[PDB]
Amino acid sequence: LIAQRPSLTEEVVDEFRSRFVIEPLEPGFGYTLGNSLRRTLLSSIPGAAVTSIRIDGVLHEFTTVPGVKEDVTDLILNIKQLVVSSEHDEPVVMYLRKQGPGLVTAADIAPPAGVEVHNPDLVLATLNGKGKLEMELTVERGRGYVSAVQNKQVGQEIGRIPVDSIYSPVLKVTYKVEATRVEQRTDFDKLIVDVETKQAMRPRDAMASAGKTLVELFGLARELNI
């Protein structure tokens, strides 16, 4: 009988994790709402990730770059978990160059204007005094995961090697429900969703994009009726 509309409140537990509560939900609504929100948050969120690279003196990812103890395949693995944010809808090229002995790191990478790497502490490879690393990286923007098979479009450029990329910047999402203090038989439940995301973006705009997708879908469903 009573009419109460859902309300959302936000709280910060860490620089990249937050909890969001929705108290007035109907009974048996919290689990479904949280699951739909989590499903859309994980699967689809715009993001950027390296979709291809180029190494001088290397024609395939199987061979090795002299001077670095990690073969090229391990370098692909290390790059695959590099987190980036790209404001250009078109592909953007980055350059990584490092001479002499030391630890190549994400901080070393050359960021073009508008493209930023957000995990500078990550280490990609190790070079000796005799070693030399020179890499071009292509950054695209998208959502979800795209395998390297569909990221290949250049054949003449034998030097280029495509890498599968992971775009979604959200790590994991978990929800919980409880019972409200209001005295009624319905016992309205309080959905609380905890979301933690990579350094690419704050959780707030991540769930903003998720809600945008969901409202677009449900608005389509409503508008096409009546």
Binding site: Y31, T32, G34, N35, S36, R39, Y175
Partner: peptide, 9 residues
């Protein structure tokens, strides 16, 4: 274990 698809525990 929460069901991934339907959502309910």
């Amino acid at each position: 274990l929460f069901d991934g698809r339907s959502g309910e525990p």
